[PDB]
Design a binder for this molecule. Structure first.
Ligand SMILES: *P(=O)(O)OCC(C)(C)[C@H](O)C(=O)NCCC(=O)NCCSC(=O)CCCCCCCCCCCCC
Ligand code: SF4
Ligand code: SF4
Ligand code: FES
Ligand SMILES: [Zn+2]
Lengths: 154, 711, 67, 118, 427, 122
């Protein structure tokens, strides 16, 4: 009923105290899409959590752009169960089975097709691109008829 | 126009007057570079971009070579190969063998392009040794390991041209050339931390992020800055449940590869004074409590008071997302209250601009509109302190065009020349009809930026009708098909979102009613007069600050780094933050605290999944459904009815326009909890260039060291 | 585990020079153990690990303002 | 815990922590696991920071000095230290002190110094 | 239009039972009543395993028996499936190499040889001559080590217990050479893409020659006990007999392939390393039974020894590691002295080397049969897909076809003649 | 059933009349077998609870209108039937299909908004 969480979904073996309540579970009837999440053997929790499909931004730290070339699908962090401190060694424990899993896709529609095939909730983030502007070494030495208002220092 | 040319066979279509390296990028060709940056002036110093061009006996520097109508470029010829190995051999001859102790390790362009374009081994074995240079004290934020300098000049170009802070230079000659102020000085620029990201190597590193993490171990989240109203796009790098560093991500519409120092260093204030469990004030002392019996004592107190219409008041702070505004708006409405105040002074009374037309309170000629601005009047705004990255974009346009800036307000220390017209409203009326007015009247794409600091001025009703009446008098120049010269500049990331959902006081009548119950929803900058002393105070937030000090209940929410909140920036762009970590302790998502206290007060807000709460936001404002885009305002001329029609008889008092940012470093609760901003303020005040100013490290007067950071 | 470390290399045929003529044992190291401690499990002196780092997030120390 | 000195003092040579995120042994060795326990059997190495600052300065007539850690290929990657500030310069990898002979007068006049200086 | 056309079932996939063809009627080679012929006989099932020897650690084979003879044999494997092929996708290539030591855990340096040869082929590099000979010498030391386990554990199951102990001193001596080149008695991690990790120590080639002078006498005395012994002969003759046509159709490799009269060794047919530089023979059996496969394995003892002696005399000088620091780690001394070397050292131990895109199937003549790996590369520093082809996995799959009608005491002999380590079978 | 006692050669449903015939024969075998599953695996539940729980696992896929999806869902059933009727599954795998033998029990998602809020998402 319009984004209402189905609190009466039948849980499975891997459902936990960190599993969110899903809204929609692939019935196996929806048109034009394979109900792969129904026959995958994955837990129901995959159908409750949202994934983000995006093109990774270039690092601010360096000018290589190899990692910006492919779309990544990753799972969003939950408010509880992602990381806690181990009482013994101080290590970071987790309940999130998807924390280290990411998928790579060549096009945005390839990722959307996979998300709908598996029943994921997905948010797509449109890439941020540059604005082209001709840059000329010669401008560094343009002539100012008036006040300088800038002392270029190489 | 477009020239056409071939690079490695393939035709590329690049505008005439651009550099070859720009066409190589457009053609899908990777060209090694160190000195060249897309957003900095061209320098030909590194020599790593040397390519082979037909009809040219020498290799040319592609970064500085303009594209011509018919040239042929080979980027993989044997000329190019031995060129790149020879430069990579020179760039590494005097480079310190400091990769295990370098912070740039694992994310270094010198390392990667040595692996890709250099030789596998080195031929430098001099008994005479390598160059070594002393370190330089250039303020608290930046740690220097200058032996690593490859002399790209990226930081001197950034500090001199983008930051307008010409204290960094290059003293010396030849191999003994050095980067740094000749006399030790504290780099004084709210953009100075960008030099650390710009550095190809780790000669400029951050003192806070000194040796804590390796880049490979960090989870990267693309989120939004909420420490200012511009909504800057960032990357939050975290190792487990602790945020390690905050980097800038590209968005040419907003922040352009740059973030200010507050948004980069305030993240250490996210692990220091956090609210992690519910608190109840018992006998004047805050006791821990559970959620079931802190929400109960909220309800019991509310039943005891039995408030009348508008006696339940909310004050929304400056880091509050739109989801919790809509939820708290609903729960407020079901309680018979429209008393929806805001943190700033004057925020508990109706605002001089309305919220009826979206164009009333937005930066209407979008942030990208400055790139073509011809004349700019700044009213009640020190943009260097209120919107740092925006201030830089103004200077970039000023340095390259015939841009005229005039300001009415308090004079500030500006990175661009500006005419000062006055400080009060008469000095606006006298300016807008004076010599600078005809600059606005004559110059195409005029721009009037009205600071959110005038909204809190007592004369804002007079200020706002003064401005727009000039805009309406001067349309077809201010109000063309694609241009709007009216722009209001937010400084808090929550204001535009509150205005969008109508989270404001509607009438003077509701404003004069004394509340018996105040929900301080992340509100910490409230004026004391806006909270009656005897009222019942609930504080919902994430940091223990002024708001929690006066609360009767304290409810711990989430910081912006562990919620996916919706925020609207000053230009009207609706962006979404991504949670990088989870909630600490017993904190709860902010919109869920509201939804639960709906059960305890008996008026449960319908939605109980965040998907449903975003459907509700769509009913209030459909633009809130559009993500990463500005929705244009259609009835932009209808704005006269709030700005001029409902502001006609204004009781002008003549008080001058006031500064809003006493301390750029201490603006919000995250900043004030930050040790790094503590050092930034103290170093600013005492003018200390020492890197270990309140930090670990050996000094003249600390032979032994110190483990305190921030004190 | 009762064998002292440099003799342990000799008994294992890992060196031919015994610690009685090996210069590497004649390094002065005031931090070096004074007595040979053997394997100390199964005894009340067994090694117990612990966290060496401080808790990540500092919580607010509640201070109620006066009324 | 508490009663033995080894459970209380961070290292045998040093009593206090030497970094801001280091856990004191008093708080690390509290709790149930450290009951019915020998604290003198617990691993307690000598603190390196105290030992490095007991090191005498290498006086040198040169602007740039080379440190490889002192064992040939058994040290650290060879680096170069500049000794032109009137302070003691220290190798980033090993911590050993270096100082130019030109600053001996100034360095000998300071009241407290980060290295023995003789 | 799969999967759309498959929603309504408009197409059926042509199964092999569709293309069945009747045999030619002319040249074709070879009911209910009161009698007891129509009567049926019940069978009972038996749970065999785990046996005492280490190699058959996790075997749960369920047999159906008609009296004494085996009707159908159903091995249940997976008891040592540890997810190696998945864990290899989250590791760099150098990090994934130790996973290969732990596949056939009695033949370690030849497991890591097939992974190195696969990665080296995608790297498009030629490894130096010295590492080629080091690898072919330690690949035959490995083959001797495995056969000492396989032959002597086989005879320990059959009930001869003394040859096992004699040859495990020979095994005990040959693991000293593993621990001198590396520091491991079992998992060396020594063979790596681009050659070997470290040069052999300076007195090892003399110590292998001293071992060599007496190893044949060890084979001869082990052979004194089993080869002509009638009890041994009468427990392996006619047991586990596979035809040459069926060994190929069953995916059999190695002595399982070679004991039925098929002359075929990967070393001779697709030479790798320094095998084209050494003279050795290939034992091929006649009757396809366990006695042939025992006699073929003993002959390989003498042939591997003959290769090791040749490798000692052709050991050339030079790098034991591909001379390129973008692929193999620089010397410690270079990394501590030269800028480029520390950069290449740092990036190889954090990111790893990139392998160019593509896929390769690479096989070697492993001691248990043919061992191969299918590696998909994505042009990055981690393998996109690693698949191990294990000779024993195909051998155990043909256990039902080979033990059918045999006795259970016969089947224990068939388990040992198939060189079976279950960490190999389950990857 | 040539290689194993309950083996069925992998077959592809020819049409919906065929596919529904196979589903009903699969359900029939499972609910027939429930007494045999309850003694071997010593399930401390009524045969009725086993049968009603078998029904739920078919009731999940009652609305599948794809013929290619039914065959994989049928093959999964046949394979599950084979490993249960041969004593290959351990009692631990079988009585772990019943989602009330968790120490948290059947109630493992929060019932509504407020009860999951007071417990921190369950
Ligand atoms: P009626 O005509 O109303 O319904 C008949 C059917 C169900 C065929 C529908 O008409 C129909 O077309 N539905 C879609 C087809 C369908 O049902 N597909 C799936 C069939 S296979 C299936 O559902 C397998 C379920 C699991 C099998 C195992 C169950 C027991 C396992 C655990 C037992 C207890 C522990 C050992
Ligand atoms: S700047 Fe780069 S190359 Fe230089 S030491 Fe640091 S990591 Fe190594
Ligand atoms: S300090 Fe860094 S950015 Fe500045 S010139 Fe040197 S290498 Fe370039
Ligand atoms: S990129 Fe053109 S010289 Fe540095
Ligand atoms: Zn040193």
């Amino acid at each position: 009923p319009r984004n209402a969480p189905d609190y009466n979904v039948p849980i499975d073996i891997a459902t936990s105290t960190f599993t969110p309540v899903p809204k929609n579970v692939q019935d196996g009837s929806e048109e034009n899409v394979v109900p792969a999440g129904l026959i995958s053997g994955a837990p129901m929790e995959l159908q409750a959590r949202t994934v983000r499909i995006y093109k990774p931004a270039k690092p601010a730290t360096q000018s290589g752009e190899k990692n910006t070339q492919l779309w990544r699908m990753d799972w969003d962090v939950l408010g509880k169960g992602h990381r806690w401190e181990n009482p013994l060694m101080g290590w970071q424990s987790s309940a999130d089975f998807m924390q280290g899993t990411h998928l790579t896709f060549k096009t945005k529609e390839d990722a959307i097709a996979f998300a709908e095939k598996q029943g994921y909730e997905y948010f797509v983030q449109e890439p941020n691109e540059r604005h082209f502007r001709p840059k000329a070494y010669a401008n560094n030495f343009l002539y100012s008829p008036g006040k300088l208002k800038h002392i270029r220092t190489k | 126009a477009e020239v056409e040319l071939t690079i490695d066979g393939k035709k590329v279509s690049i505008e005439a007057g651009s550099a070859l390296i720009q066409a190589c990028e457009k053609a899908g060709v990777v060209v090694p570079r160190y000195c060249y940056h897309e957003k900095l002036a061209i320098a030909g110093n590194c020599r790593m971009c040397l390519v082979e061009v037909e009809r040219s006996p020498k290799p040319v520097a592609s970064c500085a070579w303009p594209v011509q109508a018919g040239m042929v470029v080979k980027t993989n010829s044997p000329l190019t190969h031995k060129a790149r190995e020879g430069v990579m051999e020179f760039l590494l001859a005097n480079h310190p063998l400091d990769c295990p102790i370098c912070d740039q390790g694992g994310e270094c362009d010198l390392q990667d392009q040595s692996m890709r374009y250099g030789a596998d081994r080195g031929r430098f074995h001099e008994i005479g040794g390598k160059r070594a240079v002393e370190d330089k004290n250039i303020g608290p934020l930046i740690k220097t390991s200058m032996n690593r300098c490859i002399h790209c000049t990226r930081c001197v170009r950034f500090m001199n041209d983008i930051a307008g802070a010409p204290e960094l230079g290059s003293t010396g000659r030849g191999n003994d050339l050095q980067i740094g102020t000749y006399l030790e000085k504290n780099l004084d620029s709210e953009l100075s931390g960008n030099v650390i990201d710009l550095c190809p190597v780790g000669a400029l590193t951050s003192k806070p992020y000194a040796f804590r993490a390796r880049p490979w171990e960090l989870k990267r989240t693309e989120s939004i800055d909420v420490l200012d109203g511009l909504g800057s796009n960032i990357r939050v790098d975290s190792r487990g449940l602790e945020v390690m560093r905050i980097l800038p991500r590209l968005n040419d519409d907003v922040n352009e590869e740059w973030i200010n120092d507050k948004t980069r260093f305030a993240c250490d204030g996210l692990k220091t004074q956090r609210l992690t469990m519910p608190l109840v004030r018992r006998d004047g002392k805050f006791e821990p409590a559970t959620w079931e019996q802190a929400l109960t004592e909220i309800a019991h107190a509310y039943q005891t008071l039995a408030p009348k219409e508008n006696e339940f008041k909310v004050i929304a702070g400056q880091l509050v997302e739109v989801e919790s505004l809509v939820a708290m708006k609903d729960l407020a409405n079901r309680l018979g209250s429209e008393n929806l105040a805001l943190d700033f002074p004057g925020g508990s009374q109706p605002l001089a601009h309305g919220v009826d037309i979206r164009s009333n309170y937005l930066f209407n000629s979008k942030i990208w509109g400055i790139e073509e601005a011809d004349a700019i009047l700044l009213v009640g705004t020190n943009p260097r302190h209120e919107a740092a990255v925006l201030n830089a974009r103004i200077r970039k346009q000023w340095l390259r065009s015939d841009l005229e800036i005039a300001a009415v307000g308090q004079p500030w220390e500006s990175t661009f020349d500006y005419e000062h017209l006055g400080t009060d409203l008469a000095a606006l009326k006298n300016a807008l009809s004076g010599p600078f007015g005809e600059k606005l009247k004559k110059a195409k794409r005029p721009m009037i930026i009205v600071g959110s600091g005038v909204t809190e001025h007592p004369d804002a009703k007079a200020f706002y009708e003064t401005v727009w009446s000039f805009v309406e008098k001067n349309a077809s120049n201010f109000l063309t098909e694609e241009w709007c010269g009216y722009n209001v500049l937010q400084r808090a990331a929550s204001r535009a979102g509150a205005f969008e959902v109508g989270f404001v006081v509607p009438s003077p009548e509701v404003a004069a009613t004394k509340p018996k119950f105040v929900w301080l929803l992340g509100a910490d900058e409230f004026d004391p007069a806006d909270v009656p002393k005897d009222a019942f105070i609930v504080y919902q937030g994430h940091h223990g600050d002024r708001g929690a000090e006066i609360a009767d209940i304290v409810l711990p929410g989430a910081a912006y780094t562990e919620k996916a909140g919706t925020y609207v920036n000053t230009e009207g762009r609706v962006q979404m933050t991504r949670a990088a970590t989870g909630l600490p302790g017993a904190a709860r998502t902010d919109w869920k605290i509201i939804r639960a206290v709906s059960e305890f007060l008996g008026v449960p807000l319908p939605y109980d999944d965040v998907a449903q709460l975003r459907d509700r936001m769509a009913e209030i404002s459909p633009a809130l459904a559009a993500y990463d885009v500005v929705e244009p305002v259609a009835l932009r001329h209808l704005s006269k009815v709030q700005l001029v029609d409902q502001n006609k008889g204004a009781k002008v008092t003549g008080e001058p326009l006031k500064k809003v940012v006493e301390n750029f470093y201490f603006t919000d609760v995250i900043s004030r909890s930050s040790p790094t901003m503590a050092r930034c303020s103290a170093a600013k005040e005492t003018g200390d260039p020492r890197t270990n100013f309140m930090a670990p490290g050996m000094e003249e007067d600390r032979p032994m060291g110190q483990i305190a950071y921030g004190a | 585990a009762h064998i002292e470390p440099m003799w342990h290399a000799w008994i294992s045929y890992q060196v031919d020079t015994p610690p009685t003529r090996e210069p590497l044992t004649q390094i002065e190291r005031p931090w070096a153990p004074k007595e040979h401690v053997p394997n100390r499990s199964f005894t009340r002196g067994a090694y117990k690990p612990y966290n060496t780092t401080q808790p990540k997030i500092q919580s607010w120390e509640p201070k109620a303002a006066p009324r | 815990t508490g009663r033995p000195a080894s459970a209380v003092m961070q290292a045998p040579n040093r009593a206090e922590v030497w970094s801001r995120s280091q856990r004191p042994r008093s708080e690390a060795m509290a709790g149930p696991r450290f009951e019915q326990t020998d604290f003198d059997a617990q691993p307690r190495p000598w603190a390196a920071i105290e030992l490095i600052h007991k090191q005498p300065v290498r006086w040198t007539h040169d602007r740039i000095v080379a440190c490889d850690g002192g064992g040939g290929p058994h040290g650290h990657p060879k680096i170069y230290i500049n000794t032109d500030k009137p302070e003691i310069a220290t190798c980033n990898y090993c911590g050993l002190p270096f100082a130019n002979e030109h600053h001996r007068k100034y360095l000998e006049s300071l009241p407290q110094t980060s290295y023995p200086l003789n | 239009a799969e999967p759309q056309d498959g929603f309504q079932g408009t197409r059926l996939i042509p199964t092999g039972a569709d293309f069945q063809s009747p045999p030619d009627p002319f040249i074709d080679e070879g009911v209910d009543e009161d009698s007891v012929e129509g009567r049926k006989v019940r069978h009972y099932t038996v749970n065999f395993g785990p046996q005492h020897p280490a190699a058959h650690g996790v075997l749960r084979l369920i047999l159906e028996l008609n009296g004494e003879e085996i009707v159908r044999a159903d091995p249940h494997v997976g008891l040592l499936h540890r997810g190696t092929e998945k864990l290899c996708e989250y590791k760099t290539y150098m990090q994934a190499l130790p996973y290969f030591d732990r596949l056939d855990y009695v033949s370690m340096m030849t497991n890591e040889q097939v992974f190195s040869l696969a990665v080296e082929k995608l790297l498009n590099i030629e490894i130096p001559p010295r590492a080629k000979f080091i690898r072919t010498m330690f690949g035959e030391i490995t083959r001797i080590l495995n056969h000492l386990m396989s032959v002597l554990s086989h005879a320990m199951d059959v009930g001869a217990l003394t040859p096992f102990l004699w040859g495990f001193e020979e095994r005990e001596k040959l693991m000293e050479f593993y621990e001198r080149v590396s520091g491991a008695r079992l998992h060396a991690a020594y063979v790596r893409p681009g050659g070997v990790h470290q040069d052999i120590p300076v007195g090892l080639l003399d110590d292998i020659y001293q071992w060599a002078t007496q190893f044949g006498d060890r084979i001869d005395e082990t052979e004194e006990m089993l080869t002509d012994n009638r009890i041994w002969i009468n427990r392996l003759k006619g047991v586990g007999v596979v035809s040459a046509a069926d060994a190929l159709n069953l995916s059999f490799t190695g002595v399982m392939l070679r004991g039925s009269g098929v002359p075929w060794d990967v070393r001779k047919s697709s030479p790798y390393d320094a095998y084209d530089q050494v003279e050795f023979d290939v034992p091929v059996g006649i009757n396809g039974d366990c006695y042939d496969r025992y006699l073929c394995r003993m002959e390989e003892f003498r042939q591997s020894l003959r290769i090791i002696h040749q490798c000692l005399n052709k050991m050339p000088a030079g790098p034991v590691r591909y001379e390129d620091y973008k692929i193999t780690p620089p010397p410690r001394a270079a990394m501590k002295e030269n800028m480029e070397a520390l950069i290449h050292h740092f990036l190889l131990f954090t990111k790893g080397y990139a392998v160019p895109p593509g896929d390769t199937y690479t096989a070697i003549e492993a001691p248990k049969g043919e061992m191969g790996v299918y590696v998909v590369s994505d042009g990055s520093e981690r393998p996109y897909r690693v698949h191990i082809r294990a000779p024993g996995f195909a051998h155990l799959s043909g256990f039902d076809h080979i033990t059918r009608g045999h006795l259970l005491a016969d089947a224990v002999a068939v388990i040992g003649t198939m060189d079976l380590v279950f960490g190999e079978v389950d990857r | 059933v040539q290689p194993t006692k309950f083996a069925v050669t992998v077959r592809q449903s020819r049409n919906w009349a065929d596919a529904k015939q196979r589903v009903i024969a699969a359900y029939r075998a499972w609910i027939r077998a429930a007494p045999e599953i309850q003694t071997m695996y010593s399930i401390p539940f009524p045969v009725s609870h086993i049968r009603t729980r078998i029904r739920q696992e078919f009731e999940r896929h009652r609305y599948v209108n794809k013929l290619n999806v039914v065959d994989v869902l049928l093959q999964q059933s046949n394979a599950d039937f084979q490993e249960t009727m041969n004593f290959w599954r351990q009692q631990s795998h079988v009585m772990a299909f019943f989602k009330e033998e968790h120490f948290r029990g059947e109630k493992r998602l929060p019932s509504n908004f407020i009860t999951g809020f007071l417990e921190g998402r369950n």
